[model samples]
Target: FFLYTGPPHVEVAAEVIFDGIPGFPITNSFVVAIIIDIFVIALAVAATRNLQMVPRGLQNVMEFILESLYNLFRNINAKYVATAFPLVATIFLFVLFGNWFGLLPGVGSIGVCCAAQGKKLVPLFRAPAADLNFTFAIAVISFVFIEYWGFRALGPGYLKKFFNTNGIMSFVGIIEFISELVKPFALAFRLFGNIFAGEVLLVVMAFLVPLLLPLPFYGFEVFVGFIQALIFALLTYAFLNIAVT
Candidate 1:
């Protein structure tokens, strides 16, 4: 069966993948997220299958990546290394693969038939970063975790961010509160915008040139995907540092 036909396009919204859940429609982006989660787990399982302390092949690579990331977080705040590593590393890997997955041949271009427009196509899998819902959800999750750390570490001091501990500094506190409020929106837009644009670019190239034109863009997209994942991870680390310290 044919995958695509018309000029390149991107659906502004995510498509519903399953409607079995009452009041909650499962989206294609969510399905891709589940797959990415499984992919990461499978990689960890494969990398650790035959334990070798010497470190060779896939295990060596996985070890290097994890240690590099863990040490980087430890440098930021050794006290919270254990707390911060999981969120930052998971976000980075999930986004890294999620963005790369979009570059595949049949991702956004192939899917079940469009409901309203049956002749056209609606993709069954879209990169998690390409969907505002996925990005926003993750942004909220990160923000919540950071806030939880802040409150757990600082207790009442965390509430002082919104209204100053000293009444005279209320203005400063308000500014800080506003800054805190915008973090999630900023995080969400940053990832969603970049990934969705890359998806559009790849689709456009595939439709317009349908040849060598896409190869260069594919390399560029891979580079961009890595950079975006790093940025998200670093930002989360920075926020954690700010929150608890």
Candidate 2:
């Protein structure tokens, strides 16, 4: 007796689509990331093409969204909000787009069938955040920026947070050092796990009941995408606040 298995195949590691570059293979997720980057840039350009004294249409919407984000960061630490706003906002936008992009109908569904992988189709466009490398890279960038800001704010004194020599506080410094080292991994895995699980859930839902059943999940994923992005940015801002203070 044979039972048919219906769910789309899932790969934890992004599959390489282009191996032309020497020692550097390009994966499908990377292509999606580049597209997202260009799309964001194009959107910014379009929104700001004509400077308007009284903003309307795209410009108005863009300004409203940015200002809302600015206010959110401002409440965190008004003094350093300007310094961290750009990074936090950019991270939120990039991740938000990346998460939502995968939910598009054709993204994880359309691609060439891999010969080596048998009948499983290799998707052309995978969500960037679904890939560990993408999340890890962004986490590293966030971590570096936080450290940079800390140094800028406190100069050489920042090192004391990690290397304190005050008796009992020395252990506290070691704990601080460990937590700092763990931050990037925590950030990377949090994003990667959520997006990846969401992608898998969508695939399974579609496979089980291809029509209306998956509809609610699509909406849920959108909310999840937004929440994950917001959490990532908020945590980064919080960490930055802690480091500098």
lDDT of 2 at 1: 19
Off by over 4 Å in 2: 1-16, 19-24, 113-121, 165-170
Off by over 4 Å in 1: 1-24, 112-117
Best by TM-score: 2
How accurate locally is residue 97 in candidate 2, as Cα lDDT from 0 to 100? Answer: 84
Compared with the true structure, all predictions reach lDDT values of 0.76, 0.76
What's the distance in Å from true for residue 66, model 2? 0.6
| TM-score against truth, every candidate | 0.84, 0.86
